[PDB]
Amino acid sequence: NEMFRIFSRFNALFVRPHIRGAIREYQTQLIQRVKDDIESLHDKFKVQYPQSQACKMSHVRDLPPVSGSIIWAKQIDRQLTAYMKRVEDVLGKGWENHVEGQKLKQDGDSFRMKLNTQEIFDDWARKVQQRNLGVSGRIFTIESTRVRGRTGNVLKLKVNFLPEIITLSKEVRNLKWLGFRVPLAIVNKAHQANQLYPFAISLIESVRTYERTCEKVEERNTISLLVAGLKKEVQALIAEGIALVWESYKLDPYVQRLAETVFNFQEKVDDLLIIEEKIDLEVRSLETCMYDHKTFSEILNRVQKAVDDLNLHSYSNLPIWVNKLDMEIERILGVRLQA
Amino acid sequence: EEEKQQILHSEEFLSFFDHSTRIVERALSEQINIFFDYSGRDLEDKEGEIQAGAKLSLNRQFFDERWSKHRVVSCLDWSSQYPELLVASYNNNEDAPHEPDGVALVWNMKYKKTTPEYVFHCQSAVMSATFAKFHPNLVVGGTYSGQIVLWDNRSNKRTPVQRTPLSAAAHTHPVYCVNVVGTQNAHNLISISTDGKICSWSLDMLSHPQDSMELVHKQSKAVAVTSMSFPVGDVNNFVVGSEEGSVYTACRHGSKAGISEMFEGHQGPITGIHCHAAVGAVDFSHLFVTSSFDWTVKLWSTKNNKPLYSFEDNAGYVYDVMWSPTHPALFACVDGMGRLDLWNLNNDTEVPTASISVEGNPALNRVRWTHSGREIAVGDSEGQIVIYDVGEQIAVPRNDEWARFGRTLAEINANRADAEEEAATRIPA
Amino acid sequence: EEEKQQILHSEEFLSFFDHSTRIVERALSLEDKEGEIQAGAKLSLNRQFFDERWSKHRVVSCLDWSSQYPELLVASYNNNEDAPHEPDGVALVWNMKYKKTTPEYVFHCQSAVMSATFAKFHPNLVVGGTYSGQIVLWDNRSNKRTPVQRTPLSAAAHTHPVYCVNVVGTQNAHNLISISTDGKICSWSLDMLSHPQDSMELVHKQSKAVAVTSMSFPVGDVNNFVVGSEEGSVYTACRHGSKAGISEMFEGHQGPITGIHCHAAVGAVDFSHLFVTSSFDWTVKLWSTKNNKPLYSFEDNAGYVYDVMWSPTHPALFACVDGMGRLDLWNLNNDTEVPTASISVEGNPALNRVRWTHSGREIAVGDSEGQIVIYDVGEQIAVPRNDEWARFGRTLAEINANRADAEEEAATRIPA
Amino acid sequence: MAEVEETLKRLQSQKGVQGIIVVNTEGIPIKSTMDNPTTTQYASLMHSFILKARSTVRDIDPQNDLTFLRIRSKKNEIMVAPDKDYFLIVIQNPTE
Amino acid sequence: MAEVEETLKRLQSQKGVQGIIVVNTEGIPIKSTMDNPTTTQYASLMHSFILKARSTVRDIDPQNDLTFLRIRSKKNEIMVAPDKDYFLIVIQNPTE
Known part of the structure; x- marks a missing residue:
């Protein structure tokens, strides 16, 4: 770098009657610097691209792995070629005439041999051809399997998708950016996958929301009848989606309806959880309250306000829930009355 | 027992306990001992060696x-309304897969507290x-994943208060980076996806943006927005x-909405693009800074189709860089080696004016100075955000x-025109 | 204070205080609504x-902010035009901080109070x-709205209607100065009000005394x-001495002195020579001690300007008001020709006096109808570095220098 | 609960801390980390000091920062933080 | 000689210092250059609080030496210490 800066400063003295003398005086220093640069480039190449720390940083950049390794190799090759071109411009054409220039030419040939990337491109193409994928034709690919502790098929219904589609899309983008040949039929398949990707994301979100609703039901089994209407609506929507086919053109409207239903189910589950916590706290408090007429009236009024709010909440099976709450209040009042 | 456990688990009492712990921090950091020395005589060694890099000195990790x-x-941006702290966008919790993939911490500047004054938990990894x-x-x-969400720093919920829905018209692709855009009059927090959708949203509706469009240019070719x-x-x-x-200048409003111009000067993916971060009497809107993984920190002009000047000091894929907020000359730089290489254009052009090399390749991902630019913040692979103070050896602008x-x-x-003329003359016959 | 000092001046107490003080010192060492600094903090007409x-x-009639506590407004009213039975004239007060419209002491006056x-x-x-020829003193201590004491309305005091008065001398040695329409310069003893402590029949220009309408x-x-x-003929009035009086008849207008204050802005450049003046001829000019002629002028409004009393910090701002119902605050460092902060009151009603606060934090405005409107004057224009x-x-x-150059250019470029 | 407990353990994570106790006026602490008889006795003592400080504040100004009042004495920087529902009394150090 | 006045200036013009009183051991401020009643009332309140702190200390161990009581209030959070020989007032905000 210092020699390059000195050469840049002295470039204004090319016509002056000291350029050849300076070149003769600094030929040995330039050859030594070129050998040092070639050694540094060889050391950088010996830094393994497949497990590079810079490769980890690039993965942190979120680029595809193989494409990123190819990009790092291309950047290293670009740096080496730029250094060689700068040296050739500084020392004139036919730089291999000197012994240092011939050694630099040999090192550059070794680097060019060691920095192909065509082998990486061929390996990526061979892996893609071996894969040969295509999914999402069916909407709810029911991946029902015997869960740990439950031999019943745990239906992980979803579109026929995985992170491999995202890897293919990233690989296609990287190949387009870097200029490579590839299995253009696989490219068309990747284009279709990129088209269908937002719908797949919506389907995965719907699966997550349905799982959250199931978890909410498992928690508040004490209120599981109260959100029965939302559960039935979600079941009907899920049945419609399972009847749908992911290759169908109606996949977008079906996903929109499923998203609306999932949002409704989530909001209802949250509101029901809050209300049920309030009701259970009120019931325990009315059971344990101080045995006074005003205290009983206050607890009953709180329960009644909660009941009116729940009735406004538009839950399912409101009469059944009212009957259960009345029976519980009867048991609590009975314990109090006996005491 | 039962009463204490209920009181601690009670919402109002737990919130009061959190506020009291915040006060405990604001006192414990602010409580110096009795016979502390402040005469300033001990700074003879500090000022004696300050002649070799006063402009660079780590403050606190x-x-x-x-x-x-x-x-x-994953990101860095010093606060403004309460500038006494900074953020620390941790990457995915890969080493702790049990934890959620997004745990956003807040680095400290006013207090010597390792823990933050808030938290923004995220189900997925926080991109920006x-x-x-x-x-x-x-x-x-x-x-x-691609959800632009918000977790309040003043409330009691590190989880997303409101997440961007995974709508097909929304950013299904990963949301690479967003900018806090829009004033109080018309706030439109813009976004950029992996597909690059310019979600010029509205302040409130986190599920219905005010304006959204997947951008494309160069014969409708979709461009992955590396930065905004x-x-x-x-x-x-x-x-x-x-x-x-390929850096492409964008039009948001107008019938030509999208990347209108395309000034391409790099040789690979763009790492970071900060605009003219310090404009004095002149107007530097016709040029900006640029960073790329092609081992060369670029400077491309809004007018010049090819880039204006190239600082190719990087021996490998650089990480991130930005111009100084105060000094127009100074421009912070950072690569994978952790080489804090802030360069002052008017002062030291060819070499980086402030070279601060942290050994072991501290894995910088974004290097952002303070809003007032007192200390430049950057973090390694682990997340040790080292705030190297921007001392007056370079901080002072003339x-x-x-x-x-x-x-x-x-x-x-003029020199670029001369170099272009010399290259034209170098064409043989 | 002897016991307090002895508790302080004990050696053990002093050492303990020093140690505790050093230890404690070492230990303890909306926005959009606030976004009206350059667009509203200099003129925020609030208190009506x-x-x-x-x-x-x-x-x-006039206005002032109390030096003992600037939280109030010590201002009077003019002649009540349609109150033949009611009081002739009194003084109101609206506290700046406290929201109380009633004056703390409505000193109703039998005659029509001048200022x-x-x-x-x-x-x-x-x-x-x-x-009508009286000067009276009223106190918030007493419980009578009438005048606590009156200067003797005789030949000793200001016989003609004296529209200007000021308590010359601080708490060190106060002697209330009075200047009459009949030119009776009267530094009156603020304690013994039977006769004024000074009785000077001021006159100028070979004893042809002028009507001192703005002290x-x-x-x-x-x-x-x-x-x-x-x-x-605004002649510099020496206040102390045997020959004290209006000496240097500097003429920097073409009409009666509307309202003039000494341009006593304080900073690095001491502009005590300059004094802001306002004329009856719509001629707001900058007369000065050295500048016998008006140094610079301003004649924007057609109607007569009310009064001029610039703030005491920035010499750039010349606080005044237009006769057609608008404020007039021209910042000299900002502009020299156009009035900079020419805020417009509602309804364009005229006033006869206005004043910045004693701290310069607010510049209130009077009204011909009597609606006292107070406009805050923040740091956008009043903060003088x-x-x-x-x-x-x-x-x-x-x-x-430019005025001298322009005068020379007119003198050498007049075709004669 | 665990949030307040973790906050207490973080504020008392400083080495050599005498004791950080979430406390109460009832003579027992909400969350202390000392000897139980000493903790209850100091909780009662801090309750007495808290009542006296509350009366002192109401005598001086009845709308002050009446949620915490430390005692940064040389022995223990006794950071009393009486909350509205619970209370805290952190006998802490003069360093951190 | 000038040490007392220097201490008053130090603890009255510190980082946000409310004001310093080189008061006697009676609690009430000595040098009050305005309406003294507020100073005497606040200082009696602080003396009662300091006696409460001494009572709590003696509940723990009466042989503890105190540096200051870090009272936190919205009027003037006093890091002061009423003593049996005098009373040195230092009311300042540690964050300010």
């Missing part, structure tokens, strides 16, 4: 451990992290970086430094 | 105090004068003041 398990700084200047009780962050840049005030005008490696920087820019244009 | 028992059928101002030398009282004194220069004239004060002084010197 406001890292953590419950949220920094192999989770590098923005601190809202116009809203003082929250922050802005985007999931690596624009002039300060130019609502329509914007700049962007490309994964395929009175004529705006005019001198404009003259240096004109000289750079 | 108008007591309908007094404001209606009455005008504003008034508070006084921190004996801060329990207020002082003023009448439009003003430099800040702290108790030996020399400045008096306006109906005939315009020492450089900014020096910059304004240098701009004033450059403007003086």
Whole structure:
């Protein structure tokens, strides 16, 4: 770098009657610097691209792995070629005439041999051809399997998708950016996958929301009848989606309806959880309250306000829930009355 | 027992306990001993060696451990309304897969507390992290899944208060970075996806953006938005970086909405594009800074199709860089080696003016100075955000430094024209 | 205070205080609504105090902020036009901080009160004068709205209607100065009010005395003041001495002195020579001690300007008001021709006096109808930096040079 | 609960801390980390000091920062933080 | 000689210092250059609080030496210490 800066400063003295003398005086220093640069480039190449720390940083950049390794190799090759071109411009054409220039030419040939990337491109193409994928034709690919502790098929219904589609899309983008040949039929398949990707994301979100609703039901089994209407609506929507086919053109409207239903189910589950916590706290408090007429009236009024709010909440099976709450209040009042 | 356990678990009492612990921090950090010395005589050694890099000195490493398990700084932006702290967008909790993929910490500047004054938990990994200047009780962050959500810093819920829905018209692709755009009059927090959708949203409706469009240019070719840049005030005008490696100037408003111009000077994917971060008397809106993984920190002009000048000091894929907020000459730089290489254009052009090499390749991902630029913040692979203080060895901008920087820019244009003429003459016959 | 000192001046107590103080010192060492600094903090007309028992059928006479406590407004009312049975004239007060419309002491006056101002030398009282030949003192201590004491309406005191008065001298040695329409310069003893402590029949220009319609004194220069004239002969009034009186008949207008204050802005550049003046001929000019002629002028509005009293920090701003119902605050460092902060009141009603606060934090405005409107004057224009004060002084010197150059250009370019 | 407990353990994570106790006026602490008889006795003592400080504040100004009042004495920087529902009394150090 | 006045200036013009009183051991401030009643009332309140702190200390161990009582209030959070020989007032905000 210092020699390059000195050469840049002295470039204004090319016509002056000291350029050849300076070149003769600094030929040995330039050859030594070129050998040092070639050694540094060889050391950088010996830094393994497949497990590079810079490769980890690039993965942190979120680029595809193989494409990123190819990009790092291309950047290293670009740096080496730029250094060689700068040296050739500084020392004139036919730089291999000197012994240092011939050694630099040999090192550059070794680097060019060691920095192909065509082998990486061929390996990526061979892996893609071996894969040969295509999914999402069916909407709810029911991946029902015997869960740990439950031999019943745990239906992980979803579109026929995985992170491999995202890897293919990233690989296609990287190949387009870097200029490579590839299995253009696989490219068309990747284009279709990129088209269908937002719908797949919506389907995965719907699966997550349905799982959250199931978890909410498992928690508040004490209120599981109260959100029965939302559960039935979600079941009907899920049945419609399972009847749908992911290759169908109606996949977008079906996903929109499923998203609306999932949002409704989530909001209802949250509101029901809050209300049920309030009701259970009120019931325990009315059971344990101080045995006074005003205290009983206050607890009953709180329960009644909660009941009116729940009735406004538009839950399912409101009469059944009212009957259960009345029976519980009867048991609590009975314990109090006996005491 | 039961009463104490109920009181601690009670919501109002737990919130009061959290506020009291915040006060405990604000006292414990502010409680110096009795016979402390402040005569300033002990600074003879500090000022004696300050003649070799007063402009660079680490202040405090406001890292953590419950949220920094192999989770590098996904973003950095110093706060404005309460500038006494900074953010630390940890990467995915890969080393702690039990934890959620997004745990956003807050680095400290006012207090010597390793823990933060808030938290923004995220189900997925936080891609970008923005601190809202116009809203003082929250922050802005985007999931690596692609959800741009908000978790308040003044409330009691590190989880997303409102997440961007995974709508097909929304950013299904990963939301690479967002900017806290829009003033109080018309707030439109813009976004950029992996597909690159310019979700010029509205302040409230986190599920219905005000404006959304997947952007494309160069014969409708979709461009992955590597970063978002624009002039300060130019609502329509914007700049962007490309994964395929082609910076394209963007129009937001107008019938030509999208990347209108395309000034391509790099040789690969664009790392970071900060605009003219310090404009004095001159108007530097016709040029900006640029960073790329092609081992060369570029400077491309909004007017010049090819880039203006190239600082190719990087021996490998660089990480991130930005111009100084105060000095137009100074421009912070950072690569994978952790080489803090802030260069002052009017002062030291060829070599980086401030070379601060942290050994072991501290894995910088974003290097952002303070809003006032007192200390430059950058974080390694772990997340140890080292705030190297921008001391007056480079921090001081001259009175004529705006005019001198404009003259240096004109000289750079003249030298570039001379180099173009020399290259034209070098064409043989 | 002896016991307090002995508790303080104990050696053990002093050492313990030193150790505790050093230890404690070492240990403990909306926005959009706030975004109206350069667009509203210099002019925020907020406090509309108008007591309908007094404001209606009455005008504003003068105003001031109390030096003992600037949280109030010591201002009077003019002649109540349509109150033949009711009180002739009184003084209202609207507290700046406290939201109380009623004056703390409505000193109703039998005659028509000319003008008034508070006084921190004996801060329990207020002082003023009448439009018929009286000067009276009233105190917030007493419970009578009438005058606590009256100056003797005789040949000793200001026989003609004296429209200006000020308590000359601080709490160190106060002697309430009075200047009459008959030119009776009267420094009156603020304690013994039977006769004024000074009785000087002021006159100028070979004893042909002028109508001193606007008294003003430099800040702290108790030996020399400045008096306006109906005939315009504003001659520098020496205040202390045997030959004290209006000496240098500087003529910087073409009409009666509307309202003039000493341009006593404080900073790096001491502009004590300059004094802001306002004319009856719509001629707002900058007369000065050295500049016998008006140094620079301003003649924007057609109607006569009401009064001029610039703030005491920035020499750039010339606080005044237009006769057609608009404010007038021109910042010299900002512009020299156009009035900079020419805020417009509602309804374009005229006023006869206005004043910035004693701290300069707010510049209130009077009304012909009596609606006292107070406009906040923040730091956008009133915050004078020492450089900014020096910059304004240098701009004033450059403007003086430019005025001399323009006079030379007119003298050598007049076709004769 | 665990949030407040973790906050207490973080504020008392400083080495050599005498004791950080979430406390109460009832003579027992909400969450202390000392000897149980000493903790209850100091909780009662801090309750007495808290009542006296509350009366002192109401005598001086009845709308002050009446949620915490430390005692940064040389022995223990006794950071009393009486909350509205619970209370805290952190006998802490003069360093951090 | 000038040490007492220097201490008063130090603890009255510190980082946000409310004001310093070189008061006697009676609690009430000595040098009050305004309406003294507020100073005497606040200082009696602080003396009662300091006696409460001494009572709590003696509940723990009476042989503890105190540096200051870090009272936190919205009027003037006093890091002061009423003593049996005098009373040195230092009311300042540690964050300010």
